[PDB]
Design an enzyme around this catalytic site. Sequence first.
Site, PDB file in Angstrom:
ATOM      1  N   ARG D  13      -9.623  44.443  14.264  1.00 18.44           N
ATOM      2  CA  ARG D  13      -8.406  44.911  13.635  1.00 18.44           C
ATOM      3  C   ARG D  13      -8.645  46.160  12.783  1.00 18.44           C
ATOM      4  NH1 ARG D  13      -4.090  41.256  13.426  1.00 18.44           N
ATOM      5  NH2 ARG D  13      -3.902  41.426  11.137  1.00 18.44           N
ATOM      6  N   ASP D 141      -2.417  47.115  -0.850  1.00 18.76           N
ATOM      7  CA  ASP D 141      -1.243  46.573  -0.173  1.00 18.76           C
ATOM      8  C   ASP D 141      -0.039  47.321  -0.751  1.00 18.76           C
ATOM      9  OD1 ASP D 141       1.040  44.968   0.640  1.00 18.76           O
ATOM     10  OD2 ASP D 141      -0.317  43.285   0.987  1.00 18.76           O
ATOM     11  N   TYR D 154      -2.925  35.740  -3.312  1.00 21.53           N
ATOM     12  CA  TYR D 154      -3.158  36.955  -2.531  1.00 21.53           C
ATOM     13  C   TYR D 154      -2.680  38.170  -3.340  1.00 21.53           C
ATOM     14  CZ  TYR D 154      -2.520  40.708   0.798  1.00 21.53           C
ATOM     15  OH  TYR D 154      -2.535  41.934   1.425  1.00 21.53           O
TER      16      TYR D 154
HETATM   17  N1  LIG Z   1      -2.532  43.767   8.592  1.00 24.01           N
HETATM   18  C1  LIG Z   1      -1.591  44.183   7.715  1.00 24.01           C
HETATM   19  O1  LIG Z   1      -0.413  44.356   8.024  1.00 24.01           O
HETATM   20  C2  LIG Z   1      -1.959  44.467   6.283  1.00 24.01           C
HETATM   21  C3  LIG Z   1      -0.942  44.651   5.340  1.00 24.01           C
HETATM   22  C4  LIG Z   1      -1.260  44.923   4.006  1.00 24.01           C
HETATM   23  C5  LIG Z   1      -2.605  45.023   3.637  1.00 24.01           C
HETATM   24  N2  LIG Z   1      -3.580  44.844   4.574  1.00 24.01           N
HETATM   25  C6  LIG Z   1      -4.986  44.933   4.156  1.00 24.01           C
HETATM   26  O2  LIG Z   1      -5.731  45.786   5.034  1.00 24.01           O
HETATM   27  C7  LIG Z   1      -7.060  45.235   5.256  1.00 24.01           C
HETATM   28  C8  LIG Z   1      -7.296  44.997   6.737  1.00 24.01           C
HETATM   29  O3  LIG Z   1      -6.233  44.192   7.260  1.00 24.01           O
HETATM   30  P1  LIG Z   1      -6.462  43.263   8.561  1.00 24.01           P
HETATM   31  O4  LIG Z   1      -5.145  42.649   8.963  1.00 24.01           O
HETATM   32  O5  LIG Z   1      -7.249  44.063   9.570  1.00 24.01           O
HETATM   33  O6  LIG Z   1      -7.459  42.158   7.914  1.00 24.01           O
HETATM   34  P2  LIG Z   1      -7.749  40.678   8.506  1.00 24.01           P
HETATM   35  O7  LIG Z   1      -7.828  40.726  10.006  1.00 24.01           O
HETATM   36  O8  LIG Z   1      -6.841  39.696   7.800  1.00 24.01           O
HETATM   37  O9  LIG Z   1      -9.198  40.422   7.860  1.00 24.01           O
HETATM   38  C9  LIG Z   1     -10.266  41.344   8.042  1.00 24.01           C
HETATM   39  C10 LIG Z   1     -11.575  40.577   8.049  1.00 24.01           C
HETATM   40  O10 LIG Z   1     -11.830  40.050   6.749  1.00 24.01           O
HETATM   41  C11 LIG Z   1     -12.884  39.145   6.909  1.00 24.01           C
HETATM   42  N3  LIG Z   1     -12.841  38.019   5.954  1.00 24.01           N
HETATM   43  C12 LIG Z   1     -11.843  37.134   5.733  1.00 24.01           C
HETATM   44  N4  LIG Z   1     -12.243  36.174   4.864  1.00 24.01           N
HETATM   45  C13 LIG Z   1     -13.530  36.449   4.527  1.00 24.01           C
HETATM   46  C14 LIG Z   1     -14.587  35.837   3.683  1.00 24.01           C
HETATM   47  N5  LIG Z   1     -14.350  34.715   2.956  1.00 24.01           N
HETATM   48  N6  LIG Z   1     -15.789  36.451   3.656  1.00 24.01           N
HETATM   49  C15 LIG Z   1     -16.065  37.570   4.373  1.00 24.01           C
HETATM   50  N7  LIG Z   1     -15.155  38.193   5.159  1.00 24.01           N
HETATM   51  C16 LIG Z   1     -13.922  37.657   5.285  1.00 24.01           C
HETATM   52  C17 LIG Z   1     -12.758  38.534   8.317  1.00 24.01           C
HETATM   53  O11 LIG Z   1     -14.010  38.685   9.012  1.00 24.01           O
HETATM   54  P3  LIG Z   1     -14.542  37.738  10.217  1.00 24.01           P
HETATM   55  O12 LIG Z   1     -13.442  37.854  11.257  1.00 24.01           O
HETATM   56  O13 LIG Z   1     -15.890  38.353  10.525  1.00 24.01           O
HETATM   57  O14 LIG Z   1     -14.650  36.319   9.658  1.00 24.01           O
HETATM   58  C18 LIG Z   1     -11.639  39.352   8.965  1.00 24.01           C
HETATM   59  O15 LIG Z   1     -11.942  39.724  10.309  1.00 24.01           O
HETATM   60  C19 LIG Z   1      -7.107  43.939   4.442  1.00 24.01           C
HETATM   61  O16 LIG Z   1      -7.707  44.195   3.161  1.00 24.01           O
HETATM   62  C20 LIG Z   1      -5.647  43.560   4.262  1.00 24.01           C
HETATM   63  O17 LIG Z   1      -5.372  42.783   3.077  1.00 24.01           O
HETATM   64  C21 LIG Z   1      -3.287  44.570   5.868  1.00 24.01           C
HETATM   65  O1  LIG Z   2      -0.795  41.687   3.919  1.00 19.13           O
HETATM   66  C1  LIG Z   2      -0.550  41.277   5.055  1.00 19.13           C
HETATM   67  C2  LIG Z   2       0.770  41.092   5.477  1.00 19.13           C
HETATM   68  O2  LIG Z   2       1.795  41.411   4.623  1.00 19.13           O
HETATM   69  C3  LIG Z   2       1.083  40.616   6.746  1.00 19.13           C
HETATM   70  C4  LIG Z   2       2.360  40.341   7.253  1.00 19.13           C
HETATM   71  C5  LIG Z   2       2.443  39.247   8.112  1.00 19.13           C
HETATM   72  C6  LIG Z   2       3.651  38.862   8.686  1.00 19.13           C
HETATM   73  C7  LIG Z   2       4.814  39.566   8.383  1.00 19.13           C
HETATM   74  C8  LIG Z   2       4.749  40.654   7.516  1.00 19.13           C
HETATM   75  C9  LIG Z   2       3.535  41.037   6.955  1.00 19.13           C
HETATM   76  O3  LIG Z   2       3.471  42.098   6.107  1.00 19.13           O
HETATM   77  O4  LIG Z   2       0.044  40.287   7.580  1.00 19.13           O
HETATM   78  C10 LIG Z   2      -1.257  40.364   7.183  1.00 19.13           C
HETATM   79  C11 LIG Z   2      -2.228  39.931   8.069  1.00 19.13           C
HETATM   80  C12 LIG Z   2      -3.557  39.982   7.706  1.00 19.13           C
HETATM   81  O5  LIG Z   2      -4.483  39.534   8.617  1.00 19.13           O
HETATM   82  C13 LIG Z   2      -3.919  40.479   6.441  1.00 19.13           C
HETATM   83  C14 LIG Z   2      -2.932  40.919   5.550  1.00 19.13           C
HETATM   84  O6  LIG Z   2      -3.246  41.405   4.316  1.00 19.13           O
HETATM   85  C15 LIG Z   2      -1.579  40.886   5.920  1.00 19.13           C
END
Ligand SMILES: NC(=O)c1ccc[n+]([C@@H]2O[C@H](COP(=O)([O-])OP(=O)(O)OC[C@H]3O[C@@H](n4cnc5c(N)ncnc54)[C@H](OP(=O)(O)O)[C@@H]3O)[C@@H](O)[C@H]2O)c1
Ligand SMILES: O=c1c(O)c(-c2ccccc2O)oc2cc(O)cc(O)c12
Lengths: 238, 249, 249, 248
Positions: D13, D141, D154
């Site tokens: 991701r 975020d 969170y």
């Molecule tokens: N996706 C979104 O829409 C969104 C929105 C707002 C903010 N963000 C932020 O952007 C960043 C990336 O988002 P994402 O959706 O790509 O993240 P994600 O898939 O939720 O998590 C990224 C990785 O974090 C690792 N992780 C989780 N728990 C852990 C633990 N206890 N120890 C070590 N590693 C751990 C996992 O690694 P493993 O798979 O190797 O276990 C996972 O693959 C995050 O900081 C997220 O909060 C994302």
């Molecule tokens: O912050 C997230 C989030 O709002 C959302 C999100 C999920 C469903 C609908 C709206 C959202 O913004 O998904 C996440 C997924 C991840 O693996 C890690 C994240 O930090 C987010």
Amino acid sequence: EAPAAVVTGAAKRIGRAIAVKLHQTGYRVVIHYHNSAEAAVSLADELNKERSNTAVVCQADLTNSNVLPASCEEIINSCFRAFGRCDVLVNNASAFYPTPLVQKTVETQVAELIGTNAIAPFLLTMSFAQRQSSNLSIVNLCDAMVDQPCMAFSLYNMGKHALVGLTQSAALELAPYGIRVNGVAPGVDKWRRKVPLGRREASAEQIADAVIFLVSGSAQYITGSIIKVDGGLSLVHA
Amino acid sequence: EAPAAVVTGAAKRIGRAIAVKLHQTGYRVVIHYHNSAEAAVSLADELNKERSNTAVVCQADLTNSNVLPASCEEIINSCFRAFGRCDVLVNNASAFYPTPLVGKTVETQVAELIGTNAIAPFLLTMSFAQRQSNLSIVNLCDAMVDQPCMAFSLYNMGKHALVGLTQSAALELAPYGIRVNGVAPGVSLLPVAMGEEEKDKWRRKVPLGRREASAEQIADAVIFLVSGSAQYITGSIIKVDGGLSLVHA
Amino acid sequence: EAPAAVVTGAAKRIGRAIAVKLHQTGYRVVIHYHNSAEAAVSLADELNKERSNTAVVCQADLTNSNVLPASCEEIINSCFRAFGRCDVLVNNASAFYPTPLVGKTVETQVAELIGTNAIAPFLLTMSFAQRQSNLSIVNLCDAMVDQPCMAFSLYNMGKHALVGLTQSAALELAPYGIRVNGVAPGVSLLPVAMGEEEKDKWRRKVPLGRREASAEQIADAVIFLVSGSAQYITGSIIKVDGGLSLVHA
Amino acid sequence: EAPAAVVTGAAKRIGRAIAVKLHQTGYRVVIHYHNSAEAAVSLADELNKERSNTAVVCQADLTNSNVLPASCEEIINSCFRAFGRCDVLVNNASAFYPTPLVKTVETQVAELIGTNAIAPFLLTMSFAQRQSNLSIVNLCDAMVDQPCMAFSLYNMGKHALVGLTQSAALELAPYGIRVNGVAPGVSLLPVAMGEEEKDKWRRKVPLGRREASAEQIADAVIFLVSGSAQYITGSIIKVDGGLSLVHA
Ligand SMILES: NC(=O)c1ccc[n+]([C@@H]2O[C@H](COP(=O)([O-])OP(=O)(O)OC[C@H]3O[C@@H](n4cnc5c(N)ncnc54)[C@H](OP(=O)(O)O)[C@@H]3O)[C@@H](O)[C@H]2O)c1
Ligand SMILES: O=c1c(O)c(-c2ccccc2O)oc2cc(O)cc(O)c12
Ligand SMILES: NC(=O)c1ccc[n+]([C@@H]2O[C@H](COP(=O)([O-])OP(=O)(O)OC[C@H]3O[C@@H](n4cnc5c(N)ncnc54)[C@H](OP(=O)(O)O)[C@@H]3O)[C@@H](O)[C@H]2O)c1
Ligand SMILES: NC(=O)c1ccc[n+]([C@@H]2O[C@H](COP(=O)([O-])OP(=O)(O)OC[C@H]3O[C@@H](n4cnc5c(N)ncnc54)[C@H](OP(=O)(O)O)[C@@H]3O)[C@@H](O)[C@H]2O)c1
Ligand SMILES: O=c1c(O)c(-c2ccccc2O)oc2cc(O)cc(O)c12
Ligand SMILES: O=c1c(O)c(-c2ccccc2O)oc2cc(O)cc(O)c12
């Protein structure tokens, strides 16, 4: 003697509730109006019936023009003339309507949405400060949704942002004079249902309560602060 | 063909640096100016020597008045007249001077500080949108808007209003694919009339290097926001301030 | 009956002034403390002399650990045991000391600074809500959270997290009629260990009066937020900082 | 010669896209992972096929515990052992799940506050202690002030990460280490989520009615670590399509 307050746009709705509550707290009040003369006088009559010669009205158009500075000076002057002092300024008057970016002249919209909402508060602040035991303060009526604005309200939003800047700049600059400058930021059936504290109806009196706090001795160290009174609405994501 | 950009207040200082970097990136540019005619033409001359027919100048007063909408319409029109398109608008021009609460009349100060800093950007935004790829607007904001200089209320009000425009226009123009973002300097190029001892007082406040931003450093953030690497970014204001805004009294 | 309030870290300084003012307003109070037993009991005695059976003490360490949830449950339980209700929670207790990035272990500093400033308020909020009129929670935040003291990263992280809790809990608890707000001091009662010259340095920075906030002034904002005059206020943080946060470097 | 970067949670991701873009820019990379060993190794192998000896993996749990500081020291150490330097730290790993007010609660605290805030703090300490264009980028975020219902822990963790970004920017500036954030709105949606639920979120985004790609988030990280951002510290760039501007 009793302290005195100016409330702009005080004839109806939020400004009226603010003027009533200040009066109930023991302020003498200037009820400013532009078009709502009948309502302004009706309110002054009610307040004077409670305590004689404690309420006066003052007409001024708060649209930006070459005469806006004189109009704002007159509002402040009217307080000093009636009551011999001016302790509190409440910048409550505001215009509110959309101004789409993609399609009144636009410069008229600027005069109202920037002039009334930001420039008149600035000019009133200057006149208030220039004319100055005491507990002097200004309260600006802000907007809780300033960072999540209504669609097509750019000029309105710009004016309310400018008002935040005035609140902060004037708080800093007038602090040496002991003049505090703060804001109260209101929120608002579709809209009612969005409000986290929606079980409670929103009221002008709730807004006035926050104004009363800010002008009180219980807020004597508070300056440059804006209190949201929005039932949690600004916390709610799309 | 090459995209085109309008930069306001582009004859000198940060605006020139933005115009130069846009041109180096492949943009054709309108160099807007008010009083600095010699500097504006000189810049256009340098850019045209580099690549012919890629720079024009456009004079306009951005003080608020009943003719400001026409002047802003004309700035945008000049880009379409010279280049047949207008892809980017940079609202860089600004008036900056104190307006104590306790030379110019107050209504002139309002017209200049609120006009240049906020109303002109609004009208230029309207004209840019109405005249319509990677379309965007970048507004030159101020990282210190919440910790303002003493006695600068009108300047600060104008920059706050510019934040509001950035957010409102991002929201409203997103359906048209026009992104709207800001770059917020802390201390960059100091006023020419400022003494060195005073400049140093401000330099010493900046955590990252105890120095002001170069004009190029500000322009770099503008270049990023207009680029394809910012295609999902709208309504964002990037501080370029060396940490200044994080420093307590 | 009279409503009841829990005030954490209430033996001394700001928490004490909050407990006193809530008591003066008609509240029965739980005076929570960690080490200041003599001070806590002395306060409870003074309040009980005024109105019998209106004050109790409750001892708890608010450092993070696997038993912190039980400790926080116990603080709320103590209010129900003494008074049969719990209307107000004030999260005032705080650890404050530097943790530079470059004689406690780092995991102890995390447990103390993040536990007391953030995790304990969260668990106390959980327990308060689960055990459930004008119900509300007031968190003691920090007006300087965006202009932090040098080398105070863990403290600042904890206070930022407390802003997040204030907003998240305001949202989630609103349908239960529980309001959640904050009071954010700038410079108030300065550390006991601090020299007078250094105290005066900080006093001189404050625009309004060139003095720190009294404990009573901080308590006044808490009294407002718990009152019937704030029944539409939730998710709001009131700075009580004399303008300090508005002052540039 | 080539700079080196640590990316936490880099197997999949957003972290994967960040590791790829950094590598494409010329960085050698430590791909940190917790559970996703196969995906971490597959990424390292692909990157090493492009340029030999430019990617390693490093396993660690970033849950708060007595051993977390040592684990975070080891992650930073792994970059120095592999590449002889560590120029960039990207705090990307995150736990994300609801924690209603009304796993044990202390496990939830350890996971949500540990991954999102304490691990970034400890990694920052270790990065700085070990120390040209040095910087740290924290994945924040854009919705921290308009949080999802029942996500208090969170949200607390992500607010704490803003505080870390600002405090560390201030404290590490004298060392020439910049510290910034990238704040996604909606980017890659949970894998299990039905398209019909994904669409409810996509429809809220003003700019294009779609979520950010992982690559779009990575683009902002690449800008922040670049020579084009050398005066930028303590800044958080939203990459949210305008989502945070939209009222209820
Ligand atoms: N996706 C979104 O829409 C969104 C929105 C707002 C903010 N963000 C932020 O952007 C960043 C990336 O988002 P994402 O959706 O790509 O993240 P994600 O898939 O939720 O998590 C990224 C990785 O974090 C690792 N992780 C989780 N728990 C852990 C633990 N206890 N120890 C070590 N590693 C751990 C996992 O690694 P493993 O798979 O190797 O276990 C996972 O693959 C995050 O900081 C997220 O909060 C994302
Ligand atoms: O912050 C997230 C989030 O709002 C959302 C999100 C999920 C469903 C609908 C709206 C959202 O913004 O998904 C996440 C997924 C991840 O693996 C890690 C994240 O930090 C987010
Ligand atoms: N420099 C800093 O440290 C700093 C700090 C914070 C924010 N900023 C912002 O960054 C931007 C660039 O800063 P800067 O120092 O390079 O700006 P500047 O030199 O102060 O002003 C740029 C140009 O604005 C034009 N301008 C001024 N009044 C005008 C009017 N009434 N009508 C039309 N144009 C007018 C002038 O053009 P002519 O010369 O052609 O008359 C001037 O050259 C500005 O928006 C500024 O507010 C700068
Ligand atoms: N003072 C200021 O200038 C200022 C500025 C900004 C914010 N604030 C905030 O306002 C609030 C009150 O400030 P203050 O200066 O009065 O606070 P303080 O004296 O620093 O702390 C208040 C009480 O917190 C308790 N406490 C500390 N560590 C604890 C632990 N591990 N477990 C349980 N309790 C613990 C202590 O109780 P015992 O004495 O019983 O051990 C202490 O008396 C705090 O939240 C503070 O962060 C204050
Ligand atoms: O905002 C500015 C500013 O703070 C400063 C500034 C001036 C002196 C000391 C510190 C400053 O930030 O200078 C400016 C000069 C300009 O031509 C335009 C501006 O907007 C600024
Ligand atoms: O936040 C505090 C603080 O900034 C200060 C402070 C200390 C020295 C100079 C300026 C300050 O604001 O003191 C505190 C003392 C406490 O017991 C608890 C606190 O939270 C603070």
